[PDB]
Design a protein around this ligand. Structure first.
Ligand SMILES: [Zn+2]
Ligand SMILES: [Zn+2]
Ligand SMILES: [Zn+2]
Ligand SMILES: [Zn+2]
Ligand SMILES: [Zn+2]
Ligand SMILES: [Zn+2]
Lengths: 6, 6, 6, 6, 6, 6
């Protein structure tokens, strides 16, 4: 899956 | 905010 | 699954 | 914000 | 923000 | 998956 740390 | 379409 | 830390 | 389309 | 189309 | 650190 994707990981987005905004 | 962030947008994650997995 | 995806991980979003906003 | 960031956009991630995985 | 960044845009990542994976 | 992709990793976006924004
Ligand atoms: Zn993953
Ligand atoms: Zn936003
Ligand atoms: Zn996952
Ligand atoms: Zn943005
Ligand atoms: Zn931008
Ligand atoms: Zn990966």
């Amino acid at each position: 899956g994707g990981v987005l740390v905004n």
